[PDB]
Design a protein around this nucleic acid. Sequence first.
DNA 1: AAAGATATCTT
DNA 2: AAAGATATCTT
Lengths: 244, 244
Amino acid sequence: SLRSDLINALYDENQKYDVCGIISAEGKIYPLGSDTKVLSTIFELFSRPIINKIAEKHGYIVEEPKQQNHYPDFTLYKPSEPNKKIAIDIKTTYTNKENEKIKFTLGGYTSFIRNNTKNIVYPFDQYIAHWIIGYVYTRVATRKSSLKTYNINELNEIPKPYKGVKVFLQDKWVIAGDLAGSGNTTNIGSIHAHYKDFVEGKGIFDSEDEFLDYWRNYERTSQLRNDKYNNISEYRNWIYRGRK
Amino acid sequence: SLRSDLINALYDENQKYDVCGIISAEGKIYPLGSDTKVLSTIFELFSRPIINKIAEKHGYIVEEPKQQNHYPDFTLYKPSEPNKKIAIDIKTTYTNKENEKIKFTLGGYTSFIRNNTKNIVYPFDQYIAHWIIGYVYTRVATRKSSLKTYNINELNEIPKPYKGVKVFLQDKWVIAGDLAGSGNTTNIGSIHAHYKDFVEGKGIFDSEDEFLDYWRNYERTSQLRNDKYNNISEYRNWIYRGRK
DNA sequence: AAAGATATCTT
DNA sequence: AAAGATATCTT
């Protein structure tokens, strides 16, 4: 299927290629920096060709946003099936050591999930799937990156800002947690777990319907949350009480 | 001076080189996307070797943040004078057609300017200068060709996501404005003007001390600013009356 | 944890 | 404009 083909293509491409710099039209190469600010950008760009190739192979049109603060990174759909759109978002995070627990920010909880057309390319109801392509990289111990330029002959001598990279594709609701991923920017937080758990989808919500109800009624501050719910257990008790 | 040389080098490099993609150690090239999240990263990386080259020529050490989310992008200082550090931050914004008005977000107003060691590499009082290297690019619409990978022999064929790029170097206080650049993320806003005004330094503050005082006492919401000041005129009247 | 940093945009 | 979106991190 589209999903299985995309997952195979992602593993393969990632296992074969290692990004090491930005290149100019004149052939001069500039090395990469250490921060996720740099790496999330690199992984977004690395993924575009893969996604588009697999999508074409299945008769899916691929669209990127026009406005810069609009979700998702990629909207896939067949012209004949306008209400069966697939949303793909690329998310990045790091680990200092290979077997540590990681977590992702999974998007705002006050935008499109509460208002059908807010900050989203197409109305939220036109999407039948929301996939997360997550990249996890291990930072290198050296805090000092290279500050000189290179040429094509020196590609093998350019130091990489990451030690290793792992990728996965998974439905957003399956990996969503019950604690916010950010405060002032009100993001949904993912489960705090090992890479394997994201791959296998060991989440906390019983369904996508529960995931949505939880995040649509989550309060912004703990003060407001204390009289409602602060976690999954409390949310379920809140349902029992009659949503009050 | 360090400053004249740095801007001559940036201006020169920008005219002779055009970034067109990221490259893998295997020689595969991936095209660039058209949003600022992407170009901001590219311009940061493009600037690094130039800043380091010019700094070394003048005997300065160049240091990048050891921790993420710490200002500034580059800290320059002579070993013999640790308390006269220079902060350089790279900022990017876009324009839809050349010669329109632009504005930048100039960093937070509730972190290091109010608390000497908050989110900054070295205590704020050890910096004698805060320079902003600003990049302005004219946005260009993404085409189908940008969604495939390329080879080294095709560098000149890869489409660029920008039509033109202008660069300037100026002191932060000089180009700082009196209105916030963001709400929930409390950023200082720059003057809203044409590129030449940034190069020339036609700002609104009379001194760096006025700039600091204004932003150290700027309230976070218009409700709270109502009885204090919302702009430079009201701030000056407020100062005239005894800060009441 | 929760709250508020990092950079920049949109209406 | 002011306020709150986009992604992610740290204390």
